[PDB]
Design a protein around this ligand. Structure first.
Ligand SMILES: CCCCCCCCCCCCC/C=C/[C@H](O)[C@H](N)CO
Lengths: 235, 233, 253, 235, 50, 60
């Protein structure tokens, strides 16, 4: 017969192989498909959908609805940050549980910019100005508005727009970032401060909540599919 | 007489070399002294041949072939013979679960690449492309993962020279999927690395002293040059 | 006869040895395949601390862009911007007369990793691995730091091992120049940006190392002692900085 | 099915084989390459780089810097050789540790000519004349300048040129030479003698060092890749 | 007596999907969507802590 | 995959077989041949050379 050679790797099972296999049900009548609404062809298409961020993970607000809201008041202007977190979507607890974080948890490497949106849920009479800043990697995390205003930032003018979106530029020293906690691929920090204050008239609520959302940009991509760290099974 | 066909980068690097040996045991779980499964961090610095070959250049790009040569033996000769052994080798990329028990959920291989081997078959071989986050693999890193900053506590901001950012390339978990044999069996899998499509940049001088750790540190054996007369042929 | 004009600085010499462009490529800006460009404001020559060459000198080493951390606008941009990229122009000056003897070897090493002085692997701290403008010195033998209570956590370069366990004779594999006191009293090197990334952090990663070794002993006439100043002047090229943020203040001591 | 034959050599592992293997990470996004300066495509390109020769391997100068220098003085002319060594780059201790020797240690067979360069590190006022001779194989190693001047030789005129390069012709009885110590493929000898003397004026150093370098020529080639003899590992 | 175990591995091909759903947050209990415990997956983190 | 059949004679060693085998020294630089006098391409060419016959095989 035709000479053959049993090259290395034969008689082995690989979970990511692609070989033709015999059909267990020959000549089966396959049901024709139908146009089911909501066709998805790439997982990244889901990463571009806004997901509410569980920003407040305090011991009292954890694992309830309150963790999805950030509180604001009409107190005098202060440089103390309103909100702070790190650009580690696959490692930060506040972002790892979002759709972006969940998808990233299935992959080892990722790249691309992100959109962070904030929605104001106060009254119409309420108005104010807020600052949202992104500190690039390699610098001490901002501790006051004075350090926050040294980098990319956006102004949320509550009174003209009820929502504000900020785009995080792809400032990195590597082509791709890792989905684990490591100082090699730090993504920087994102902080939110007051600009002047929240102003409300008489007979108006003085405690108003804002909602945060995170989504992927058009350039977002992932690679090196891997198992997630938020899954377990008995035995 | 020149030819220069065997002196090319491909010819120089396209050779199989053993980088690690993973040891596993098939025994009763109740014996805490036995290791039912093993985990090995992927790296070429555990050996000296391929490490020395690779350190000839500062930067490199290449695809890789992994070969798993499996051997096994008995710990006794008074218990007849055991059944054929089947081995599972699972790849754990960064951030993926690390198996904790021999039969925990992490072995479901829902999304982790896995290779199943039957004893006696030709050694399993797999191919992987370039998976470096950067544009080229780096064998040396003159820097730190974390840079301490003024005002930081002395217990924070510290990192080892060079650390590891581009070197986090996952691990391999090896286990036996067959039932625990009544008689203890010891198995060893040799991992052979074979690079292909090798491109190199920034040549470096060959190592002169024995390798001590993944870095460039040395402690002894710093006298490689022998004695020879100045005017002696 | 050489004239190096860059930015607002000019170096003129009549005892040069031409020049070597590392890997045959000059520094260039990133091609397509908001940035900050100081241009001439940063692309100029800065003079580092002058060292003394004696009979017992074992060698000196500097790190780049570490040596330029305090050199005005370049260091300011490095500490203000997360990522950066720039080539280097290095000029080594070693004046001598017709009665002097000796030779210096200048080596531009990419990823110049040096062995530590401690038993623990890679246990040198950042503050000791980044000397700054003053660079460091080479030792004639390996000394092990046994101060367990307060380890020095410094490098322990060995002259004949090049500080990385490699014979000094092979150090010529790197882009190099030879300053021979009988032919030329200065040398110049052009080092393009070298890294696995188009841009990288200017504080976490060092791109180049400059090693000055005494290839031949220093001597003068029949005198029992002589000293020769060695000056190292470095200029960044094609400066590019990215990721503006709050100023970074590396820890000291 | 199609008849097959299991020819000899199947089901075997060969470390120098070339067979296609399944991809463990299908559809991976490979990071595009970049033009990193210093591209090398052949190992011989490194063999052409000059490497300083540790010529003086005396018990006092061994394993330090002093082994890289050869001493010269202003003494009267003598036929005693200044320097002597054998053309065994892969076996001679003074050449086996150079880049040429290290590369040759990875191969069993080699061929081609070589360049030996010498640099004078004395003072400007110092002048002299030196002889560098190559004795072909099959003859008693030169013991004096009188025997040295019978073969190929070059004159180093210290005072006009600070460096002198000599090319070793490929005088061999075999197509390729071995990288081990054997009389079958002797490469000859290389010796360095005084011509008149080293001359220095008053108030000038009387002990001056020279540096040796070795490099491969354009016709150099190697074959039969093999493991080196300068590598070891515990266990 | 001999004991044998067969692991069944499922590998889908030519996969088309519709109507995306949010990822599961609590441990799976039964083929349905029921849950009994482990309903606190979110850890603790300061509001203004990086 | 492609269906295969293990026909009789497989997994056998035959001293007069002819099958391609992997190269143990890939990309080797083979020394060019030279025109050595006395080329022989067939053994019969030697059979045509006169050979002295040991005709007298007596005990002495
Ligand atoms: C069971 C399936 C196993 C799958 C194995 C996949 C492992 C992939 C590892 C990629 C390693 C890349 C090659 C190493 C690069 C350089 O050596 C490092 N950058 C320097 O240490």
């Amino acid at each position: 017969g035709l000479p053959v050679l049993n090259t290395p790797g034969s008689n082995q099972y690989l979970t990511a192989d692609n070989y033709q296999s015999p059909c267990a049900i020959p000549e089966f009548d396959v049901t024709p498909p139908i146009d089911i609404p909501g066709e998805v062809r790439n997982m990244m298409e889901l990463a571009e959908i806004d997901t509410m961020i569980p920003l407040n993970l305090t011991n009292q607000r954890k694992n309830t609805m309150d963790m999805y809201r950030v509180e604001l008041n009409d107190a005098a202007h202060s440089d103390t940050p309103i909100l702070c977190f790190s650009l580690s979507p696959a490692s930060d607890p506040r972002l790892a549980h979002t759709m972006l974080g969940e998808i990233l948890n299935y992959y080892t490497h990722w790249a691309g910019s992100l959109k962070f949106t904030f929605l104001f849920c106060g009254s119409m009479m309420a108005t104010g100005k807020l600052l949202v800043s992104y500190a690039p990697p390699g610098a001490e995390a901002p501790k006051s508005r004075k350090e926050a205003m040294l980098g990319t930032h956006v102004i949320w003018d509550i009174g003209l727009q009820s929502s504000c979106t900020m785009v995080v530029p792809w400032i990195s020293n590597t082509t791709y970032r890792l989905t684990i906690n490591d100082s090699f691929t730090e993504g920087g920090y994102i902080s939110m401060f007051y600009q002047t204050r929240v102003v409300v008239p008489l007979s108006t609520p003085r405690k108003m909540d804002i909602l945060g959302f995170v989504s992927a940009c058009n350039d977002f991509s992932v690679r090196l599919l891997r198992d997630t760290t938020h899954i377990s099974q008995e035995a | 007489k020149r030819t220069r066909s065997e002196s090319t980068v491909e010819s120089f690097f396209a050779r199989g070399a053993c980088v690690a040996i993973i040891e596993v045991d098939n025994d009763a779980p109740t014996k805490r002294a036995s290791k039912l499964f093993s985990v090995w961090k992927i790296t070429y610095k555990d050996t000296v041949q391929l490490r020395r070959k690779l350190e000839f250049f500062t930067y490199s790009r290449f695809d890789m072939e992994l070969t798993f040569v499996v051997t096994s033996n008995y710990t006794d000769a008074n218990n007849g013979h055991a059944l054929n052994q089947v081995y599972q080798i699972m790849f754990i990329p960064p951030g993926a679960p690390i198996p904790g028990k021999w039969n925990d959920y992490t072995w479901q291989t829902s999304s982790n690449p896995s290779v199943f081997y039957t004893y006696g078959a030709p050694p399993a071989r797999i191919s992987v492309p370039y998976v470096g986050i950067a544009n080229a693999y780096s064998h040396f890193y003159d820097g730190f993962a974390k840079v301490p900053l003024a005002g930081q506590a002395s217990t924070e901001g510290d990192s080892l020279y060079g650390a590891a950012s581009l070197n986090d390339f996952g691990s391999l978990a090896v286990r036996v999927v067959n039932d625990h044999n009544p008689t203890k069996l010891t198995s060893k899998i040799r991992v052979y690395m074979k690079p292909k499509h090798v491109r190199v940049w920034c040549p470096r001088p060959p190592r002169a002293v024995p390798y001590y750790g993944p870095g460039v540190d040395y402690k002894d054996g710093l006298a490689p040059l022998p004695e020879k007369g100045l005017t002696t042929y | 006869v050489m004239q190096l004009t860059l930015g607002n600085s000019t170096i003129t010499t009549q005892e040069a040895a031409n020049s070597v462009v590392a890997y045959g490529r000059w520094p260039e800006y990133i091609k397509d395949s908001q940035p900050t460009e100081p241009d001439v404001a940063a692309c100029r020559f800065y003079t580092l601390d002058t060292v003394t060459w004696r009979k017992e000198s074992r060698g000196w080493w500097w790190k780049l862009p570490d040596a330029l951390k305090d050199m005005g606008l370049f260091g300011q941009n490095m500490f203000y911007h997360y990522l950066g990229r720039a080539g280097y122009t290095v000029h080594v000056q070693c004046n001598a007369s017709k009665f002097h003897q000796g030779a210096l070897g200048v080596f531009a090493v990419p990823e110049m990793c040096l062995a530590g002085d401690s038993t623990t692997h890679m246990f040198t701290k950042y503050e000791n691995a980044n000397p700054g403008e003053k660079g460091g010195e080479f030792k004639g033998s390996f000394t092990l730091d046994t101060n367990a209570t307060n380890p020095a956590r410094n490098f322990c370069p060995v002259d004949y091992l090049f500080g990385s366990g490699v014979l000094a004779g092979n150090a010529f594999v790197y882009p190099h120049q030879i300053i021979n006191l009988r032919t030329n009293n200065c040398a110049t090197l052009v080092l393009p940006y070298v890294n696995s990334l188009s841009i990288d952090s200017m504080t976490k990663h060092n791109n180049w190392g400059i090693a000055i070794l005494p290839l031949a002993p220093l001597d003068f006439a029949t005198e029992s002692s002589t000293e020769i100043p060695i000056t190292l002047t470095i200029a960044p090229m094609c400066c590019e900085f990215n990721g503006l943020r709050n100023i970074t203040v590396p820890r000291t001591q």
